[PDB]
Design a protein around this ligand. Structure first.
Ligand SMILES: CCCCCCCCCCCCO[C@@H]1O[C@H](CO)[C@@H](O[C@H]2O[C@H](CO)[C@@H](O)[C@H](O)[C@H]2O)[C@H](O)[C@H]1O
Ligand SMILES: CCCCCCCCCCCCO[C@@H]1O[C@H](CO)[C@@H](O[C@H]2O[C@H](CO)[C@@H](O)[C@H](O)[C@H]2O)[C@H](O)[C@H]1O
Ligand SMILES: CCCCCCCCCCCCO[C@@H]1O[C@H](CO)[C@@H](O[C@H]2O[C@H](CO)[C@@H](O)[C@H](O)[C@H]2O)[C@H](O)[C@H]1O
Ligand SMILES: CCCCCCCCCCCCO[C@@H]1O[C@H](CO)[C@@H](O[C@H]2O[C@H](CO)[C@@H](O)[C@H](O)[C@H]2O)[C@H](O)[C@H]1O
Lengths: 383, 383
């Protein structure tokens, strides 16, 4: 029965995913504070995009409520009512549990559950909906029967949940903090190898946008000489943090490996279909190379030849270790195409190695794909 | 075609209504800070109930989105995404438009649209859903087609809406402020006569909970000698404001008029049915008298004899003028039954007039109902 629940989990997370790229474009274009775009336009874009990121816990609460109730809007209302009661209950009870002043909890974020408290608030709303959406009350309460009971009981259950989270949360929030320091500073080779492999595994579903947020915007901290504080690999690299640039492995497979795989898919098509397939693969190899958008190459083989995608996910994972071990760094602000590679080159290290390790990634992806497509008779484009 | 839209308006507001009474019980029992109930329990109840009131704009945005999209949860998500972008856009643009520092706007609430910005954010989400929920994109954007486009375009439209509200809002927020001062201090006789009549008109639908919030919790301001600031007739009366107690008209029709109407409904039933009807009406007359809950008497005649309900709504309106003109004051914390009348009597004025004007309300409601039920042959309980 677990597969029918993994469908509901995926469905619940695709609502949050649907607003991440527009928020990232608004916050990116706005916070860049360009000279050619006016001051008020930049601030409105930054505060609009930053609003969608600040609402992420509530967006997750709604996605989980809708994904487990067959998209009923009263569950989304019940999740919004539950989340606000639960966050407020933790602010009252966490000071008592921790033995620290409420201003220390609030200023150090010691009781901040983030998206996890959103997921729990959605799980309350979904459970209360499926058990009570058909409840019959006595006639003196008949105006509040059925679906109208669900927000009320979700709010009452959010009190008890916020009390329990005030006891359970401190060892969880501590473990989340030690993971961030481990991934940024103690073993970035292992951490970013796991990030690249799991990101590839989530791309077929579009779920990688959620996985990218912590590594891009939350892992590690930097303060510059002006006292500005920066979190996550992307802001810390543009801020000039010498220990940023852990995401640089993306240039190897997005500029060299996947473009080379596209030519290996083209060269292995049947002759009658080889000319027609070539234009799809060129178009797709130039999109990956220039802009770092990879799905028109990935989706061309991913479903009909899953073994090529497992090899690609391994080689895309191993790309992040290689850059960290060789000491080759460069930034991204959108994705690892030639545009980000040239634009963000000012803070870079050993930039001349990306061509040299890249021709290795091109030889490896090309020769894997040509050999396996013939040998296994994989039904890639044109066969 | 307007009636099919008034159904959608009512349906959209009954979602917000469904969470008002639990929030009022939590905030009331919590903020009372009783000695018999422990300190942490009081604070958790107060902050839980206060959270549902603070979320009212967002709860209205969801109710309007769901009420105009046939309850689709992606419209509730789009309303949550729109509301947060629109509030943030006004915080950036209102300083520029007004020519005042952003800290003056934020501290004086000059750009705070309240529930009206919630309703607009829901109207964006509903419009964008009904125009775009079936949109077909080119294949490179196919993962974001259909319903997944609706939150994105609602967020983009929330930017332009927040810019327009930054120009349109200042003369609206000013008019809302002058209405509050008019209703509290300049013509409370006319204002609370309109409040009682319109409240009765909304009771058949349960919509009176929304109408009661501004008069009970937002009209007028009081500062006591300890410097605590209180808003709305209920908090200001318990705080000891000499100009509070405008809601005291409820004791006349809830303790005397409606109990008397219940005996007039009983006495006019056919003899075979008169004994059976008596117990419903006694039960219902004691519920109104003790606790100020009035629907078991109102709903007994309201649909089958609407003329009696129009007369009742007029007499319930006229009850608030009578108390303000005679200078008879008393508080409510739940509703105008004997419990609130005895409990809140300490801050009262001319308390001995409620029995004297009440026996007038009893004679008027009894004699209207007995005469009209016979004369018009109204099919009230037992006929
Ligand atoms: C697909 C299965 C696996 C996926 C899940 C694994 C990863 C866990 C999800 C990550 C949680 C996202 O968490 C959310 O991120 C954004 C962006 O950082 C934060 O946003 C915060 O920083 C951004 C700037 O970066 C501000 O614009 C925003 O105002 C702020 O509050 C949210 O406050 C946080 O709640
Ligand atoms: C459409 C252009 C808009 C202007 C962009 C320039 C503004 C600067 C800030 C933009 C931030 C974009 O944010 C970034 O987007 C890229 C591409 O979508 C995402 O990257 C991911 O998306 C695409 C498909 O969705 C994949 O092929 C790609 O391999 C994967 O890495 C990231 O998860 C995010 O880091
Ligand atoms: C049925 C048709 C006619 C009905 C509509 C006519 C009346 C207009 C609707 C009133 C709007 C309610 O507005 C909403 O009220 C509550 C309670 O005051 C406010 O709540 C505010 O005060 C309460 C205490 O009273 C706090 O607990 C809360 O933290 C706070 O932010 C909301 O911040 C405000 O947004
Ligand atoms: C169930 C008892 C719970 C304990 C109550 C004591 C705690 C003190 C704070 C309670 C606040 C209740 O809030 C108050 O509720 C009453 C009764 O619901 C409402 O009053 C309205 O509701 C009922 C029906 O719904 C009507 O018959 C009544 O005529 C009408 O005035 C008010 O709009 C609100 O002012």
């Amino acid at each position: 029965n677990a597969f029918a629940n993994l469908q509901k989990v995926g469905k619940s997370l695709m609502l949050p995913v649907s607003v991440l790229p527009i928020a990232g474009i608004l916050l990116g274009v706005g916070s860049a504070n360009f000279s050619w775009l006016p001051a008020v336009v930049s601030h409105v874009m930054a505060e609009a995009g930053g609003s969608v990121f600040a609402n992420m816990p509530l967006i997750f609460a709604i996605g989980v409520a809708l994904g487990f109730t067959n998209n009923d809007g009263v569950s989304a209302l019940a999740a919004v009512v539950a989340y606000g009661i639960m966050v407020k209950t933790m602010a009252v009870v966490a000071p008592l549990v921790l033995h620290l002043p409420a201003e220390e909890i609030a200023s150090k974020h010691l009781a901040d559950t983030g998206v996890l408290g959103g997921i729990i608030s959605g799980a309350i709303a979904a459970y209360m909906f499926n058990r009570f959406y058909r409840i019959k009350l006595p006639e003196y309460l008949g105006f509040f029967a059925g679906k109208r009971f669900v927000p009320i009981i979700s709010g009452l259950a959010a009190i008890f949940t916020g009390v329990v989270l005030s006891f359970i949360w401190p060892p969880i929030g501590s473990a989340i903090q030690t993971f961030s320091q481990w991934a940024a500073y103690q073993n970035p080779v292992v951490a970013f190898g796991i990030y690249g492999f799991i990101e590839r595994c989530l791309v077929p579903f579009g779920l990688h946008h959620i996985w990218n947020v912590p590594f891009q915007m939350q892992i590690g901290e930097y303060t510059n000489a002006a006292g500005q504080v920066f979190h996550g690999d992307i802001p810390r690299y543009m801020a000039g943090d010498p220990t940023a640039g852990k995401l640089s492995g993306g240039f190897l497979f997005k500029m060299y490996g996947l473009p080379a795989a596209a030519i290996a898919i083209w060269h292995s098509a049947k002759p009658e279909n080889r000319a027609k397939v070539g234009g799809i693969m060129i178009s797709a190899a130039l999109t990956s190379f220039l802009t770092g958008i990879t799905e028109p190459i990935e989706f061309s083989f991913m479903f009909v030849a899953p073994i090529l995608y497992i090899i690609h996910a391994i080689l895309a994972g191993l790309a992040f270790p290689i850059c960290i071990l060789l000491g080759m760094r460069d930034g991204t602000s959108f994705s690892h195409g030639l545009i980000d590679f040239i634009v963000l080159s000012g803070n870079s290290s050993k930039l001349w190695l990306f061509p040299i390790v890249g021709i290795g990634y091109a030889i490896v992806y090309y020769t894997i794909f040509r050999v396996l497509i013939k040998a296994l008779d994989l039904k890639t484009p044109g066969r």
